[PDB]
Amino acid sequence: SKLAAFGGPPAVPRDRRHVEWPLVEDEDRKAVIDALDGARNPVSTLEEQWAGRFGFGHCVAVSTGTAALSLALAALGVGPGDEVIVPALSFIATGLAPVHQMAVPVFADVDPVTFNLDPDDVERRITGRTAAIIPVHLHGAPADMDRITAIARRHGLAVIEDAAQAPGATHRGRPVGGIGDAGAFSLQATKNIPTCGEGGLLVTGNAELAESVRRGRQFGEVIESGRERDYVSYGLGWNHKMNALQAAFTSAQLTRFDDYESARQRNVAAFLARLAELPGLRVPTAAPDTTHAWHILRFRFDPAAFGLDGVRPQALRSALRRLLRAEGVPMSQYQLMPLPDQKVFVDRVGFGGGYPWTVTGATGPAAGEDHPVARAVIADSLTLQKRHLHPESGELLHLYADAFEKVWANPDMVATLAGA
Amino acid sequence: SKLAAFGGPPAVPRDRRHVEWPLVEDEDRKAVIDALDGAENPVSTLEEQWAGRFGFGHCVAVSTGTAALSLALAALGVGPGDEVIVPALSFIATGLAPVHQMAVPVFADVDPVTFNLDPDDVERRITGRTAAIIPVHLHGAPADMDRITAIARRHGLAVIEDAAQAPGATHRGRPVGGIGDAGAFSLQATKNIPTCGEGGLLVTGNAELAESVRRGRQFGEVIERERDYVSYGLGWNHKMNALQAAFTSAQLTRFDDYESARQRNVAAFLARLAELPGLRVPTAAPDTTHAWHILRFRFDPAAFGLDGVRPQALRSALRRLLRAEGVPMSQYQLMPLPDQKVFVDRVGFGGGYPWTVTGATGPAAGEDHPVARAVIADSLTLQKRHLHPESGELLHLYADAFEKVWANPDMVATLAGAA
Numbered sequence: 001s002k003l004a005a006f007g008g009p010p011a012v013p014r015d016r017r018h019v020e021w022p023l024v025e026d027e028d029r030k031a032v033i034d035a036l037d038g039a040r041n042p043v044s045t046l047e048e049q050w051a052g053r054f055g056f057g058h059c060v061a062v063s064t065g066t067a068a069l070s071l072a073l074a075a076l077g078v079g080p081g082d083e084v085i086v087p088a089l090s091f092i093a094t095g096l097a098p099v100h101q102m103a104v105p106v107f108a109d110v111d112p113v114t115f116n117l118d119p120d121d122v123e124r125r126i127t128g129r130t131a132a133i134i135p136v137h138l139h140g141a142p143a144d145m146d147r148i149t150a151i152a153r154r155h156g157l158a159v160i161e162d163a164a165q166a167p168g169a170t171h172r173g174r175p176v177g178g179i180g181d182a183g184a185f186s187l188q189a190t191k192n193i194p195t196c197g198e199g200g201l202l203v204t205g206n207a208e209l210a211e212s213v214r215r216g217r218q219f220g221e222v223i224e225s226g227r228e229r230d231y232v233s234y235g236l237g238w239n240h241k242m243n244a245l246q247a248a249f250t251s252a253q254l255t256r257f258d259d260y261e262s263a264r265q266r267n268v269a270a271f272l273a274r275l276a277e278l279p280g281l282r283v284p285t286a287a288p289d290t291t292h293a294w295h296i297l298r299f300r301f302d303p304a305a306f307g308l309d310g311v312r313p314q315a316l317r318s319a320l321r322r323l324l325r326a327e328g329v330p331m332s333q334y335q336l337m338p339l340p341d342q343k344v345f346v347d348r349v350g351f352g353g354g355y356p357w358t359v360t361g362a363t364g365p366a367a368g369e370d371h372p373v374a375r376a377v378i379a380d381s382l383t384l385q386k387r388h389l390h391p392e393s394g395e396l397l398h399l400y401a402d403a404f405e406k407v408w409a410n411p412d413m414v415a416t417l418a419g420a
Numbered sequence: 421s422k423l424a425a426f427g428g429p430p431a432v433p434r435d436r437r438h439v440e441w442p443l444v445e446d447e448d449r450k451a452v453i454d455a456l457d458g459a460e461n462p463v464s465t466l467e468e469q470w471a472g473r474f475g476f477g478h479c480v481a482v483s484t485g486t487a488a489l490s491l492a493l494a495a496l497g498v499g500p501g502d503e504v505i506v507p508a509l510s511f512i513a514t515g516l517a518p519v520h521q522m523a524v525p526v527f528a529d530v531d532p533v534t535f536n537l538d539p540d541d542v543e544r545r546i547t548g549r550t551a552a553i554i555p556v557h558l559h560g561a562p563a564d565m566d567r568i569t570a571i572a573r574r575h576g577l578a579v580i581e582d583a584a585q586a587p588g589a590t591h592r593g594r595p596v597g598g599i600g601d602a603g604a605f606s607l608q609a610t611k612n613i614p615t616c617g618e619g620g621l622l623v624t625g626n627a628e629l630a631e632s633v634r635r636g637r638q639f640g641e642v643i644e645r646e647r648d649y650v651s652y653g654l655g656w657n658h659k660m661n662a663l664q665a666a667f668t669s670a671q672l673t674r675f676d677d678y679e680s681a682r683q684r685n686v687a688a689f690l691a692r693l694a695e696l697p698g699l700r701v702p703t704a705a706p707d708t709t710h711a712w713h714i715l716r717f718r719f720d721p722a723a724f725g726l727d728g729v730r731p732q733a734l735r736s737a738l739r740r741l742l743r744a745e746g747v748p749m750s751q752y753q754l755m756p757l758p759d760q761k762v763f764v765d766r767v768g769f770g771g772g773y774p775w776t777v778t779g780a781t782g783p784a785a786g787e788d789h790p791v792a793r794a795v796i797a798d799s800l801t802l803q804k805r806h807l808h809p810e811s812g813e814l815l816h817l818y819a820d821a822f823e824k825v826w827a828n829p830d831m832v833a834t835l836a837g838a839a
């Protein structure tokens with residue numbers, strides 16, 4: 001039982017490591033070919049099925065999760081001179097969506113355990129220009145929506161949920177996406193309910209918001225089955241149309257969602273139960289009165305547990321990454337820096353001439369504090385992506401737990417590697 | 421034959437009317453299935469195949485033709501405080517692409533025969549803010565690229581070709597898209613080389629421009645090395661779907677076979693209609709070929725003794741009589757782009773941006789662009805049906821319908837003159 005990093009046998013054999021995601025069945029292939037030969041509407045069918053399944057008043061299918069967010073901002077009257085508060089830790093799309101609607105993104109620090117935007121820090125970053133908050137259900141964990149909605153009601157702000165990483169997740173038993181003014185979902189191939197490529201869904205209880213998004217996704221036009229296209233546009237629109245084939249594929253995926261979801265919940269629970277026993281390993285958790293979608297598993301590692309009183313947390317992160325990967329556990333980072341460090345948000349050039357920042361006069365150094373929690377989380381955390389999403393990954397996650405337990409049984413070697 | 425409108429048999433029987441487009445063959449189905457099962461990559465493959473067929477230095481596959489246009493503007497440094505000259509007759513995406521990049525679209529009138537940006541009207545509308553021109557190869561007719569490129573080079577402007585309606589068309593033997601600084605194509609299901617849904621291609625000879633669009637389509641990231649999520653500037657999700665890319669690769673393999681049939685079929689169709697007095701068939705301008713994406717016909721009221729009457733009256737009469745024969749005659753654009761609410765209201769993203777950067781204003785509804793209005797007033801279009809390589813016999817039935825209607829000028833005049 002020598003470490004694989006030093007010639008030992010890997011806890012995960014090479015021929016056991018591959019996982020297919022999306023999980024393509026013959027029903028998926030048939031759905032795509034049927035959509036191709038049907039020559040049409042799978043998009044409105046997906047809209048109805050998603051709204052029905054998750055109890056939303058309205059669902060508008062769009063090209064991408066990013067387009068869902070930007071069309072949501074447009075529909076809620078967010079634009080030039082407006083600030084949108086988003087988390088300092090997220091996928092870059094959350095920070096770009098405001099820029100796409102010519103609004104200025106304002107970065108709030110996150111919670112050290114939930115990894116979601118800290119409502120206390122949101123309050124500290126509100127100005128007279130604040131128009132909206134994009135809470136992200138990051139990694140599949142629902143954000144503090146009671147606090148976010150309370151802040152929004154106080155200051156008259158719009159709330160758009162970025163639920164891209166949290167399909168099926170609940171907050172006080174409510175489907176995520178239906179709590180804010182609108183909710184954004186991504187059907188990107190890597191996501192928990194994927195399409196065969198790109199896709200987005202905007203959900204809302206507000207008929208007028210839905211209609212705005214419906215027009216915005218198709219050049220501002222009104223498009224109806226049986227009615228000849230007149231090319232009359234009623235406002236600023238884009239090409240944010242979903243592909244029918246991708247819609248048909250996701251409809252097929254939805255018929256297995258409940259079974260896939262049960263397997264993930266059971267498999268992830270068993271995996272984290274074993275890792276939670278390892279000292280200096282913090283398994284990801286759902287906050288109280290929420291359920292986690294487990295899109296990404298982020299683990300925080302404490303140098304204290306390996307007697308590394310002096311060692312930078314990044315050194316332990318590096319050491320654990322090398323050792324776990326050698327055993328065949330594909331441990332990754334998800335985001336190397338807080339979004340505020342990204343060149344686009346530092347240079348503040350945007351479209352050109354500093355727009356949208358030029359409108360608010362936020363062209364010079366960023367207002368408010370640094371984001372030490374976002375930085376601390378990145379400094380000491382590794383992630384598992386994709387492999388745990390597959391319903392038959394039970395045995396694979398058992399071997400992952402073997403690898404973790406094996407690495408933790410060599411604490412002297414971890415401390416040595418962290419030393420260099 | 422007696423007119424269908426007055427109880428005769430239609431020139432086009434209903435069982436001949438339906439045309440499948442895109443034309444889906446087993447090779448398309450296998451390409452799509454292989455793309456699902458595939459899990460080097462179909463997007464990269466299409467980029468190479470498209471660049472190779474049309475002789476472009478660089479091809480960047482993107483979500484849509486609209487995204488190809490807006491990313492091209494971004495790459496050429498067009499943005500806030502800039503103006504972009506576009507034609508007053510086009511698909512709205514041509515006018516929207518500048519707004520999408522926070523620039524102001526400036527509409528120039530079109531030529532009464534070519535329906536393309538009139539270089540005589542471009543020169544008038546250049547200001548200190550003009551940064552670019554987007555000539556459209558509208559309906560498949562290459563624009564006057566001699567005069568548009570000359571104007572641009574004389575004034576230090578960028579040229580982006582909107583070639584969405586003209587794949588395979590040439591200007592002085594040069595593939596359209598490759599003449600400007602950059603060229604945009606649409607692979608939308610209705611286009612001459614379609615995908616099974618949405619798709620776009622940006623082509624250019626400039627490596628730096630291609631790299632800008634490559635980053636712009638994927639959140640500003642460099643993708644090949646594990647994904648590090650490092651963004652180098654303002655980006656979007658303008659990624660093409662691999663499945664749509666694979667489908668278009670299959671279509672592109674058959675493109676010139678379809679071109680050969682399509683070009684023969686349309687030429688024979690237009691030769692028959694060209695004989696009918698007061699009917700102007702569409703034409704390729706000198707030193708160009710036509711892709712025939714859309715066939716736009718202009719009708720002269722003088723030919724029907726309606727010299728006094730609104731051309732729209734004749735347009736409506738001909739549309740009614742030809743549709744009764746089974747010819748799906750349509751309009752393509754009911755108004756010049758500058759009459760569209762987005763360009764009239766100048767609200768844009770909100771607070772009048774992008775117009776607010778400069779305090780730039782535009783024309784009110786109905787104010788300008790008389791030729792675009794004149795063309796809309798007296799023209800009907802054929803869309804889709806003539807694109808299919810097997811539509812030879814169908815277009816001959818359409819020609820039978822036109823000849824029937826033109827053999828009854830008194831009945832055309834009566835309908836045109838009626839309340």
Ligand SMILES: *Cc1c(COP(=O)(O)O)cnc(C)c1O
Binds near residue numbers: 186199
């Ligand atoms: C994937 C994702 C998005 C954007 O989705 P796309 O469909 O890729 O545009 C936005 N936010 C988060 C948190 C995501 O994970």
Ligand SMILES: *Cc1c(COP(=O)(O)O)cnc(C)c1O
Binds near residue numbers: 484556584585618
């Ligand atoms: C179709 C088209 C576009 C835009 O293409 P999409 O792929 O639909 O975004 C732009 N210009 C012209 C002339 C077009 O015909």
